[PDB]
Design a protein around this ligand. Structure first.
Ligand SMILES: CN(C)[C@@H]1CCN(C(=O)c2ccc3[nH]nc(C#Cc4ccccc4-c4ccccc4)c3c2)C1
Ligand SMILES: CN(C)[C@@H]1CCN(C(=O)c2ccc3[nH]nc(C#Cc4ccccc4-c4ccccc4)c3c2)C1
Lengths: 274, 270
């Protein structure tokens, strides 16, 4: 159905339901603690955001994030169980991803196999296609968002990652006189969703290589690499990676969003199927 | 700066001004002619009913007022006063007796090359002012360019003292994951005003928009291709310099589209 938005008056009201545990992350987003349902003994993750620390700006952001998490339902988009709201704090009860962020796993593993990247990108492709079909653009897809809920080494000694997309604070839902409108305005309005595709292309590069596709010593020097967008292969690791994977890479990071592949086209690509 | 005077009711502002005929009406509210009883000066007052519009539409007018307060330019509309009753908001602005430029163009048909140069020169100065102060209009069109006075010169050519209005849509403008079109949008957000100048100049010379179609999708395809057709009979009398600046103001890529400061320095305006 729909997510309950329970309005309570202090932390003890929500502590009647859940046992609060250790802290899993902290930043400008608030803090995320482990929690255990006293009734069902199920493990959850509770994101506490202090409404009084962050002004009306970050609170209006948090309200759209909650509104988007309420309406989405997908196997690889984080599940919002309930929302509790005191006058001071706001609590987001979500499914627990015990294995942490994908960025931490990549840094400890080095890089991933082509099949392991294939599975992760397929999950990303399905979730991003779901969001785009519902007029939702993530706008901030990166390895620090992709949570991992469970792991599985199969018989091929290849790891299967059950990933979960999080952080919808920057997300937006899609919707002047036309004779006066400029081409880049038409492109930005008609291709407002293609930034998620670029992010999928970037994360696929980092899973295969272990380094970002563009890196520099200054911000601008980095921006210039992005505009050129020259995907550099010839590296020592690419020949054992199929040509079919490099074609979909080139399709995911077309500099022009006009010919950048779409989410639905991605799902139909032979590299994710066969 | 402009004081934001909070008053009680409509009779209170009618103590200051004598209200006259209505000059415009729409979703933006209504614009009346008004005369200061004390000073005898005529102004244009935009009355906005804070419930007839709405909260989404009231915040628009709040940013327009904040932008009109900080700008000062001989071809940007002057905001004299802002009065606020609990039910309405009043913007006292300098009166442009001659109305909108779109109405003048439709009645006249098209303009001479010198008449267009005077209009575009004023536009170029005003848009260069805004860009130099990091402000983008984003909605420049013939329906915005107000005309305060007209003057026929010795050559039987009209001199238009224009005023830019409607700033409601104006803006005061992890990296490794960022997409190219976002960098392009963040770096070239101001060039749309330049494209609007090119459109306005084409319509003043030609009398028709540079891109027109029977459907929106066909219209967008024309715009993204950006093909400038100078084949009509009135282009034969238009100098090559005017067509060159037209092609520069309507470069499809905003990266290669001429800037406001470069426009002011172009040979056609000098
Ligand atoms: C600012 N963004 C980058 C962060 C990314 C995650 N963010 C969350 O809000 C969030 C929402 C729902 C969640 N379900 N399970 C989560 C977890 C976890 C975890 C497990 C082991 C070790 C570390 C973490 C961890 C990592 C980063 C941040 C918090 C915890 C989880 C996290 C915002
Ligand atoms: C919705 N945009 C397209 C319209 C464009 C003008 N807009 C104004 O708000 C505004 C602000 C300050 C102003 N000073 N003098 C003005 C005038 C006038 C006038 C004179 C004769 C005949 C008609 C008009 C006229 C035309 C259109 C709208 C209102 C009045 C004036 C107008 C919004």
């Amino acid at each position: 159905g729909k997510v309950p938005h329970i309005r309570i008056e202090n932390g003890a009201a929500i502590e009647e339901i859940y046992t609060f545990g250790r802290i899993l992350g902290k930043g400008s987003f608030g803090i995320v603690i482990e929690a255990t349902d006293k009734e069902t003994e199920t493990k959850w993750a509770i994101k506490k955001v202090n409404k009084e620390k962050a002004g009306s700006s970050a609170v209006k952001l948090l309200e759209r994030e909650v509104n988007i998490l309420k309406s989405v339902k997908h196997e690889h988009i984080i599940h919002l169980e309930q929302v509790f709201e005191t006058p001071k704090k706001m609590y987001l009860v979500m499914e627990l991803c015990e294995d942490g962020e994908l960025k931490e796993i990549l840094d400890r593993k080095g890089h991933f196999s082509e099949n392991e990247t294939r599975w992760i990108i397929q999950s990303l492709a399905s979730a991003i296609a779901y969001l785009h079909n519902n007029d939702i653009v993530h706008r901030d897809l990166k390895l620090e968002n992709i949570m991992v809920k469970s792991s599985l080494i199969d018989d091929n000694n290849e790891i299967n990652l059950n990933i979960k997309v999080t952080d919808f604070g920057l997300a937006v839902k899609k919707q002047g006189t036309p004779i006066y409108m400029a081409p880049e305005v038409i492109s930005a309005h008609d291709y407002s969703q293609q930034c998620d595709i670029w992010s999928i292309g970037v994360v696929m590069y980092m899973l295969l290589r272990g380094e970002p596709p563009f890196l520099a010593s200054s911000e601008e020097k980095l921006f210039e690499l992005i505009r050129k967008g020259e995907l550099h292969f010839e590296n020592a690791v690419w020949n054992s990676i199929s040509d079919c994977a490099k074609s979909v890479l080139k399709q995911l990071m077309k500099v022009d969003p006009a010919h950048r592949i779409t989410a639905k086209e991605l799902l139909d690509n032979q590299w994710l199927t066969g």
